[PDB]
Design a protein around this ligand. Structure first.
Ligand SMILES: O=C1N[C@@H]2[C@@H](O)[C@@H](O)[C@H](O)[C@@H](CO)N2C1=O
Ligand SMILES: [Ca+2]
Ligand SMILES: [Ca+2]
Ligand code: NA
Length: 432
């Protein structure tokens, strides 16, 4: 039988080794390219904001990598400024930087990390204020407030309430919670008679710009943040809306192909199937199904992705649901499978979820390890699988934390109170 504590130690060792590569090759920069041993920018070309450092902080603290955590916190306090004449994508900036500063604040108690999270949220608020509906524009200039691109989508208007609602709790100012909730209510009030929303929306007209309902591309984390706002804030509207939206998806989007459960895109009014693609991103939804009281359905959905892992090694970035085969050969070093394994495991503690996640971690080690860290893949169909040259910022917050939480039973987390954002930032449950 597997020694889960020895596996947790191995995860921690690999994470510390990756951190050392970041310090050596990419210190203060947004992402490491771990094959070349170089860095790249994420938000603003040539004006890095320490993205991967910020994304790593709560993971380092949970693992007891205290010297490394403090080195990162001290860098942020000396160096990280948002008074920058450049355009930032509102969605990415909130889930990665506001959320990463909040989880590091909650772990450490350090007021400067909260001050920086709040400064950044106030710059992002200008994107919501530029719409008469309160729907955020996709980009905002961090210094001047000027906005660009109102042709947005459910994920990019509806993935704010966890971070903004925690800011409201800590600061006492309800304006953040209210701004985030108003944008979600807009699209919920425009549900069709069958209970679905199209995934594409215009921030100035307030109207849908497509007819496609989705659980993945353009939409994923909207549905997650409805449940999460009930769990974090006790919001009764969000509890109702979470269950309503998922029951509409199970009635009109759930379809079986070759005996396996999938959720293709459909016309939001008629329910006709409008696409045959499913993203790897959709695997999050197996865990959301369990959280909202649909665990049998969640397990059935997880099984579709378990099939893909057993057949292809690495889950394909996109599949055709009619054949079960890849639509793309590259990957993004994606975290959604161990996300779902952790969320289902928190319900019943079944060791099956540990065995499935251990396969996923061992496959990551066999395919993505490079000279100075872990990289996304070029082609999952060759042997060996060929590599690209990038460690995405979300790797530092997500799958190494998921594996460690599944295997370590760490005393630094109250597992009964644990709450994670869509970027895996811990927003409740630290034990100091
Ligand atoms: O479209 C995306 N959705 C998810 C996000 O919810 C978050 O998990 C990561 O930024 C990242 C992990 O794959 N994601 C995306 O690129
Ligand atoms: Ca996510
Ligand atoms: Ca979640
Ligand atoms: Na983080």
């Amino acid at each position: 039988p597997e020694d889960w504590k020895a596996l947790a130690a191995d995860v921690r060792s690999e994470f510390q080794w990756a951190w050392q590569g970041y310090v050596a090759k990419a210190w203060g920069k947004d992402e490491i390219n771990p094959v070349s041993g170089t860095s790249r920018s994420f938000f603003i070309e040539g004006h890095d904001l320490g993205l991967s450092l910020v994304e790593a902080l709560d993971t380092l603290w949970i693992m007891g990598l205290d010297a490394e955590f403090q080195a990162g916190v001290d860098w942020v306090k000396a160096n990280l400024s948002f008074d920058v004449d450049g355009n930032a994508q509102v969605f990415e900036t909130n889930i990665r930087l506001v959320g990463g500063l909040l989880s590091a604040h909650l772990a450490s108690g350090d007021p400067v990390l909260l001050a920086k999270a709040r400064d950044l949220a106030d710059r992002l608020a200008k994107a919501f204020e530029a719409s008469p509906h309160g729907l955020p524009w996709r980009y905002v200039n961090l210094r001047t407030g000027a906005v660009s691109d109102p042709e947005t989508n459910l994920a990019e208007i509806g993935t704010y309430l966890s971070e903004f609602g925690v800011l409201s709790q800590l600061t006492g100012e309800r304006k953040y919670f209210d701004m985030a909730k108003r944008a979600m209510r807009h699209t919920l009030d425009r549900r069709s008679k069958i209970g679905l929303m199209a995934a594409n929306i215009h921030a100035m007209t307030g109207a849908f710009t497509s007819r496609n309902a989705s659980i993945d591309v353009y939409a994923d984390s909207f549905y997650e943040y409805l449940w999460d706002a009930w769990a974090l804030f006790g919001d009764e509207d969000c509890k109702r809306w979470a269950v309503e939206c998922v029951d509409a998806q199970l009635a009109h989007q759930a379809k079986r192909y070759d005996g396996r459960l999938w959720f293709p895109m459909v016309d939001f009014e008629t329910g006709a199937v409008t696409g045959t693609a499913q993203s790897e991103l959709a695997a999050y939804y197996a865990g959301l199904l369990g959280q909202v009281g649909r665990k049998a359905q969640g397990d059935d959905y997880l099984a579709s992705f378990t099939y893909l892992q057993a057949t292809f090694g690495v889950i394909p970035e996109s599949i055709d649901v009619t054949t079960g085969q890849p639509r793309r050969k590259h990957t993004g070093l994606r975290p959604e499978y161990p996300d779902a394994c952790l969320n289902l495991w928190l319900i019943d503690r079944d060791p099956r979820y540990r065995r499935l996640a251990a396969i996923h971690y061992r496959e990551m080690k066999a395919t993505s390890r490079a000279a100075f860290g872990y990289t996304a893949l070029k082609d999952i169909t060759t042997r060996p699988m060929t590599q690209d040259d990038n460690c995405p910022g979300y790797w530092w917050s997500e799958q190494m934390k998921y594996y460690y939480l599944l295997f370590s039973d760490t005393p630094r987390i109250d597992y009964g109170q644990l709450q994670l954002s869509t970027e895996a930032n811990v927003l409740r449950g630290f034990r100091k």
